[PDB]
Design a protein around this ligand. Structure first.
Ligand SMILES: CC1=C[C@H](O)OC1=O
Lengths: 285, 266
């Protein structure tokens, strides 16, 4: 129908320019696959969208899959990192929403690793009508310990991290990569290292400060979207009591998938498992 | 139609007036370029795609009769460029993709301003006066191994093609080797060993950079010299200190700088 043509015609204009459209190139957005079922893959700290490469083939035959880099990723032009604007997660949220709008996507499923899990939680709250479902990996509503809440991190602790990062970043990253991967998977470690080196140390520091800062405990109940909470065995940055908290307290229908593998980056270190986990979590919505 | 763009997972990344095309080789897909891509995308527009035979393309699109030789792969390459309205670019080709781009620029001389060939050979079989690196009997044995039990073969093959001890490269390759349907791997493997471009090398006009690694199972040092001597365009050879047939997987800290220098002006 012609009317269909002209309706898409104006929304390309209504919105040409924006944040969104220009973003497509800035954030290296990629659409792959076929399906009327849309899936967004959102990576976390220290990586870029290449982190999803191993599991990507298992999704593209019957999903259209959207990937983008977080603005803090080393694969993004670092002049684009506005230190004021990206003070807290809300601004990363706006980017996601602007990407999806520019692509003209009214309903999708969202997969988020780590801080991207936070981003997705907030986006779902901002736009309950856009996310049919959430899949959350290595996710935490709050990293800092609190009076009754074990986050896994003390303030004095993160401050030590900060210092090490600022003192020699490349050395810090080399040491960090294995601890974050956790498992003895030398290929995940060398991949995580590489994207970690790509980031500019000041942006890494800004982003980490922004993550450790965040606390979503208060708004978990506002989520209306079904969630799959994916938790690995000995996640260094996510205790099991947290995964446990996150699940009880999300207000949409929530299921937990407890992976047998250890480490915080299963999409890198356990793709043989996570791919199948992901097919199942994304089969209907 | 450029439903081809979708079928082959085509991707465009970066910014710049200079276009670059990255084309991968046997047993991988465009993810093989991920480590060096961020070194190109600031001042290049980069086009990546998957060969019709990659494990990340729907295997139903693989027509055994059509893709009987390399001309069809070339067709796909050119169609991608036409669908994107790219009139000129630099091409970066690994292994079989090195052969492809050679055929391509012969076919459309105006389209490719420069070629960069990695792990490149015009012919893998040995011959009377020609040391290519392989013999027919030995090839037949690989086919048997691949047909007998494909995964177990892939696992043994990965580390030897990677060459060097870089387990991370071993694991990526092995992984994308696993993704290929066995019958498609054989057919493409087959096509590559029956290919001989020695006769058309002199027809290339584009300037070329030949990237040779130190102990490449598939590519004797002398093959690179041969390429150099017979390519019909202005040609230079870059010798990598590193070992192995897949430097974008196993030496990306080195290869990226090589590529930056190879693609800085054209
Ligand atoms: C999970 C996490 C720890 C690291 O320091 O930065 C992070 O985002």
């Amino acid at each position: 129908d012609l009317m269909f043509t002209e309706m898409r015609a104006e929304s390309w204009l209504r919105g040409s320019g924006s944040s969104g459209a220009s973003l497509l190139q800035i954030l290296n957005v990629r659409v792959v696959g076929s399906g009327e079922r849309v899936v967004v893959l959102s990576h976390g700290f220290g990586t870029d969208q290449s982190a999803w490469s191993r599991v990507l083939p298992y999704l593209t035959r019957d999903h259209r899959v959207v990937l983008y880099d977080l603005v803090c990723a080393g694969s993004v032009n670092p002049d684009h990192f506005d230190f004021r604007r990206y003070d807290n997660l809300d601004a990363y949220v706006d980017d996601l929403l602007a990407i999806l709008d520019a692509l003209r996507i009214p309903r999708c499923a969202f997969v988020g690793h780590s801080v991207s899990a936070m981003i997705g939680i907030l986006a779902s709250i901002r736009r309950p009508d856009l996310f049919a479902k959430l899949v959350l990996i290595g996710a935490s509503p709050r990293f800092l310990n609190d009076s009754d809440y074990h986050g896994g991190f003390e303030l004095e602790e993160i401050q030590q991290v900060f210092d090490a990062m600022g003192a020699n970043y490349s050395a810090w990253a080399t040491g960090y990569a294995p601890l974050a991967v956790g498992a003895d998977v030398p290929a995940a470690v060398q991949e995580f290292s590489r994207t970690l080196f790509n980031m500019r140390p000041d942006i890494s520091l800004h982003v980490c400060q922004t993550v450790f800062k965040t606390d979503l405990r208060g708004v978990l109940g506002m989520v209306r979207a079904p969630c799959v909470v994916v938790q690995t065995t000995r996640d260094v940055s996510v205790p099991a009591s947290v995964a446990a908290y996150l699940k009880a307290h999300l207000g949409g229908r929530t299921t937990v998938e407890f992976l047998q593998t250890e480490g915080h980056l299963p999409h890198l270190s356990a793709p043989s498992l996570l791919a199948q986990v992901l097919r199942r979590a994304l089969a209907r919505y």
